[PDB]
Design a protein around this ligand. Structure first.
Ligand SMILES: [Ca+2]
Ligand SMILES: [Ca+2]
Lengths: 219, 221
């Protein structure tokens, strides 16, 4: 389908770059960003992210997801309320500028809130002696990285359905390091050898392209 | 030792929550942030982070590290230059508001640059279907968290390989990578050989982390 981005910022620019090859619509009030937006691989809709009519024009209804990052947390929350009037099921991902506004965004309808400064501050605290942890985080989240983090869903009828982590022996078989399994609303990091996989489970792993393809085929 | 923070923002506020117990000096020009800075646990120094005299009284010389986060790109650069006039080796970690200034920051002397909007933008792109990757980055940076453990001189594993070390089964800590020199080796091969100085990046619970520390300690009287 398509993804809709509300607001044009250093965060949303990086997001668009990472969605290369995907259809994207960017909705913003500053008409001067159209060229960069087009060059960046997306369609640009000039409008107000807090206005239902404009959110509808940017094709919010039925979108795979809507990403929101307006200049202010107050503007961001108004946009979320607006999206929910159009599609109460579409996934909404919003950026919070200040920690004190996170819950407000969730209440408005955000399914996920990303707080750049909370992540940066935590990384700052972990970088007093060296920068390996920050390096790890920034790199595995990049689609272009040689060894990156991938999400692989366990399809219905998978050979691993009902199979334990131990028996799946994924790392030796694929080369992919399993960091966690997403099931329902939670994430199980380093699942016990006992853990039994289920269809619908999301395997979070790290590996090179080759190893990733192997995991997909294995799964 | 002690850590110095230049400037004040939501990022340094969060950093402080993480550095509790450690001695921290915050140097900032807007006197309006003094209240919050003291409540966060840091000693406050009102001054110009771009001025050598103010950086010196904030204890930059000999610090463990200096974290720099100023709104101005130019000011961040000026701050780094000031730090380098005082201490040529102290670790400098700077925040970049815009991707385009990352290299100017390194040119000035920053050892590391953190780009909040790059990390956020990538997480946005990875969160289209679900939020597990974001859930990961959160749960690990704050039962199980990511940790760095240095291989000491004369360490038991100093010379042993990943296959032989079988650290995950022995400690329960999952090894996500090894830091050596200035390169990070993610998921070290079976043939990889631990060396003194290496930094092991792992995810585990406090007890599993402790097991790793002892499994890695040096054989010294
Ligand atoms: Ca933003
Ligand atoms: Ca900042």
């Amino acid at each position: 389908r398509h993804v809709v981005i509300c607001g044009w910022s250093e965060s949303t620019l990086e997001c668009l770059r990472e969605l290369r090859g995907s259809e994207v619509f960017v909705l913003a009030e500053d008409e001067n960003v159209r060229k960069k937006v087009l060059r960046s691989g997306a369609n640009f809709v000039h409008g107000d992210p807090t206005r239902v009519s404009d959110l509808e024009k940017a094709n919010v209804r039925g979108a795979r997801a809507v990403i929101v990052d307006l200049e202010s947390d107050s503007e961001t929350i108004h946009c979320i309320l607006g999206i929910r009037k159009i599609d109460e099921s579409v996934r909404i991902i919003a950026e919070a500028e200040r920690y004190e506004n996170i819950e407000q965004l969730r209440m408005a309808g955000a399914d996920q809130v990303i707080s750049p400064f909370v992540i940066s501050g935590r990384l700052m605290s972990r970088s007093i002696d060296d920068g390996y942890e920050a390096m790890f985080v920034q790199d595995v989240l990049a689609e272009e990285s040689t060894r990156r983090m991938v999400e692989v869903p366990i399809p219905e009828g998978s050979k691993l359905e009902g199979v334990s982590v131990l028996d799946a022996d994924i790392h030796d078989v694929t080369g992919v390091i399993i960091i966690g399994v997403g099931r329902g609303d939670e994430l199980i990091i380093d699942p016990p050898r006992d853990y039994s996989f289920r269809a619908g489970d999301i395997i979070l792993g790290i590996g090179k392209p080759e190893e990733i393809e192997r995991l997909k085929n294995y799964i």
